[PDB]
From a paper:
Cytochrome cL ([name]) is an essential protein in the process of methanol oxidation in methylotrophs. It receives an electron from the pyrroloquinoline quinone (PQQ) cofactor of methanol dehydrogenase (MDH) to produce formaldehyde. The two electrons are subsequently transferred from PQQ of MDH to the heme of cytochrome cL through an unknown mechanism, followed by its sequential transfer to CytcH, [name] oxidase, and finally to ATP synthase in the cell membrane for the generation of ATP molecules. To help gain a better understanding of the mechanism, we determined the first crystal structure of heme c containing [name] from the aquatic methylotrophic bacterium [name] [name] at 2.13 Å resolution.
The crystal contains four Ma-[name] molecules in the asymmetric unit (ASU), in which the active sites (heme-binding pocket) from each subunit face each other. Although it appears to be a tetramer in the asymmetric unit, Ma-[name] likely functions as a monomer in the cell. The structure of Ma-[name] contains a typical [name] fold consisting of six α-helices (α1-α6) and four 310 helices (η1-η4). Among the structural elements, four helices (α3, α4, α5, and η2), comprising the CXXCH motif, envelop the heme, as found in other cytochrome cL homologs. Each monomer of Ma-[name] contains a heme cofactor covalently bound to the heme-binding region and coordinated by a metal ion, Fe(III) in heme. The iron atom is further coordinated by the axial ligands, including H92 and M132, as in typical cytochromes. Interestingly, three additional metal ions, Na+, Fe2+, and Ca2+, were also found in the subunit, with the Na+-binding site coinciding with the metal-binding sites in other structures. However, Ma-[name] contains two Na+ ions (1Na+ and 2Na+) mainly surrounded by the loop between α3 and η2, in which a few residues form coordination bonds with the heme molecule. The Fe2+ binding site in Ma-[name] is coordinated by typical metal-binding residues H94 and E97 and further stabilized by hydrogen bonds with a nearby water molecule (w11) (right).
Numbering used by the authors:
A (entry chain A), D (entry chain B): 33 to 183
B (entry chain D): 33 to 182
C (entry chain C): 34 to 47, 53 to 183
The structure:
Amino acid sequence: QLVFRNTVTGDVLDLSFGKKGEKTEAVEHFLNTGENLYNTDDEAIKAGESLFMTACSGCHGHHAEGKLGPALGDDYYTYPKNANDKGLFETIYGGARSMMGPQYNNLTKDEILHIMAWVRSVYWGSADKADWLTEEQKANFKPAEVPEDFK
Amino acid sequence: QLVFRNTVTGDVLDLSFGKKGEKTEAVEHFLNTGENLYNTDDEAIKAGESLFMTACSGCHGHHAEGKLGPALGDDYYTYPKNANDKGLFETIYGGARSMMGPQYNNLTKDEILHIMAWVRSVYWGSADKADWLTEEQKANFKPAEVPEDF
Amino acid sequence: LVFRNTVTGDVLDLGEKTEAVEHFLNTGENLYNTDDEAIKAGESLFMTACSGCHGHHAEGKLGPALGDDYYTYPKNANDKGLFETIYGGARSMMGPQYNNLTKDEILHIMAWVRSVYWGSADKADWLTEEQKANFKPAEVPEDFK
Amino acid sequence: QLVFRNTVTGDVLDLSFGKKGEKTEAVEHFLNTGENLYNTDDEAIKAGESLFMTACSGCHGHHAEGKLGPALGDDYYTYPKNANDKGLFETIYGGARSMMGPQYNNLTKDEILHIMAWVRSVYWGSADKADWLTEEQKANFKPAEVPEDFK
Ligand code: HEC
Ligand code: HEC
Ligand code: HEC
Ligand code: HEC
Ligand SMILES: [Ca+2]
Ligand SMILES: [Ca+2]
Ligand SMILES: [Ca+2]
Ligand SMILES: [Ca+2]
Ligand SMILES: [Fe+3]
Ligand SMILES: [Fe+3]
Ligand SMILES: [Fe+3]
Ligand SMILES: [Fe+3]
Ligand code: NA
Ligand code: NA
Ligand code: NA
Ligand code: NA
Ligand code: NA
Ligand code: NA
Ligand code: NA
Ligand code: NA
């Protein structure tokens, strides 16, 4: 019985709100466990890259290096819960401050998990701060390519 | 095909960018004529509403009333060529200045024509400044409700 | 003169007023546009209040470039309009300045903003026709085109 | 030796340019020790308030609650060195990422210390995490109220 909460207000997120897609295995798994099955799925990561460019790149940069909103590929966080997949989904679904609007009406839950897998795949921060990774994944993790513009 | 120019630099746009698919009838007609077939197709306009909310509403508002970027439903334009569909397409595809980046990597040319059709559908400006409309359309054009957001 | 919000069109509520502020409230004309000392002071206030969002050379960053002849709001090509936009704010991040800055400080900023203009004389609606005829555009910032 | 380093790059900060202003007691003392004399000066806190509204509120909110940039009054920091006065000065002076540009051309070093004193005055986090406070101040610490806009 997971309690999903708004990143800014702490209000409960009603996950039945917003754009309905097919009720996929990744979404049912996520609603039960806060684990994103697409983190390891190369096909899903590819589809997440394309959804991030459409929905996110204008504010976060085509390499998640940050532009108007922050870098999403680094181990620095505005909200520390965004280091884990339950928090990241909450921030995307429910929105945060200012121009970071909720995406519940723009994207299905399955599309958000695709985008989330892609955001994790381009990570260039330290394994020690990667809360979404298992101890096994950390031990075997190489930081991805830093974007130039991250300085 | 016509020559499509970048709104900021005046340089020619590469419309062949990407490998998402082959041109739709609407896209091939638009590249030849600058006319957007979706402007009068209610189904195309609804798909464009959803595409606009996902790609554009963060910076231009959920009613195209403006937020970080300008209102798109009014009859003033920062770039007056955006009152016609050729200009509008060039601005979206190629980008403009500051936070208005090019969309050629975010959206297919067909999705952009879907978005443009929805943007024209919500216009609340005068018929006389609506350069994308035909005289038949201008005679029967009634402005959309001005959103209370703006 | 009646002063209106750039976005809503609502009245702006506008004392120990300077000559420039009294002249501005009666005419919509900014005396500081030709006062080199006032343009220097406006540079320092612009860097404090504006450069974070509009850049150190008014080239644009969060908000638009202010030195070019493209406007989001066409009235910002005249000093009455520009004053309304700064005083009363616009959309999103462009908040009202009426509590942060005096009217006199705003006129200093506006004088500096006009001093770094790099667009066309034709679109410079704050210049008289004789100022246009003797127009000397400022350098175009490297981070703009 | 007290060396000031850029929050993003780690490069030594050059303090000889920007808005020169005047060498003040508070600035000389801070460049020698990393201690902000303005922190306990109610007159300086009031001046810092007006400088923050003019220079900072557009991105950080009128109550330092966050808007486009982070909340500054809470006890979570994107960059944990900002919990001390040396780190906070470095981030303000030399900037951070995305839209947090350097402020050394916008403000004198003295103006920055005024803003910093005001930011510490509105702090609503825990005494345990307020590194800039002496242990007298921390044993006597009363956090400011949480502004509504923080949510
Ligand atoms: C501009 C209109 C934006 C779009 C589109 C998206 N984001 Fe965003 N985001 C933006 C800002 C201005 C901020 C800071 C807001 C705040 O409350 O401080 C954000 C924040 C995020 C975060 C938090 C990051 C952290 O360090 O904690 C995440 C994870 C984030 N945004 C993700 C994200 C994704 C995946 C988007 C596409 C669906 C997306 N954002 C769109 C501005 C904008
Ligand atoms: C924030 C990251 C933005 C996103 C996402 C989109 N737009 Fe935008 N747009 C933005 C700004 C800051 C500006 C002004 C730029 C300038 O050079 O003045 C714009 C401008 C436009 C225009 C020009 C309108 C005019 O008056 O001439 C159009 C037609 C426009 N934008 C459309 C648009 C569409 C359809 C988007 C989704 C695909 C979109 N923009 C995204 C900021 C942002
Ligand atoms: C970030 C928090 C900002 C600060 C501080 C200032 N401005 Fe701004 N400005 C900003 C945005 C995001 C926009 C677009 C808003 C909109 O409603 O479309 C603006 C807009 C302006 C304009 C309009 C320009 C036009 O082309 O019509 C002007 C003249 C303007 N801003 C001036 C300005 C001055 C002088 C400031 C210091 C007092 C200032 N702005 C601060 C974002 C931000
Ligand atoms: C908008 C153009 C901004 C203005 C004006 C100011 N700040 Fe800012 N700040 C902004 C963003 C987008 C961020 C996040 C940057 C990042 O690298 O993550 C910041 C960050 C800060 C911080 C870091 C806080 C932390 O948790 O570590 C501080 C201390 C900070 N900003 C202070 C600050 C002050 C005092 C300002 C007025 C002089 C100021 N900022 C202006 C965006 C913007
Ligand atoms: Ca958190
Ligand atoms: Ca034009
Ligand atoms: Ca106007
Ligand atoms: Ca640190
Ligand atoms: Fe980019
Ligand atoms: Fe809205
Ligand atoms: Fe700059
Ligand atoms: Fe505010
Ligand atoms: Na991060
Ligand atoms: Na970050
Ligand atoms: Na328009
Ligand atoms: Na407009
Ligand atoms: Na302009
Ligand atoms: Na402009
Ligand atoms: Na914070
Ligand atoms: Na903090």
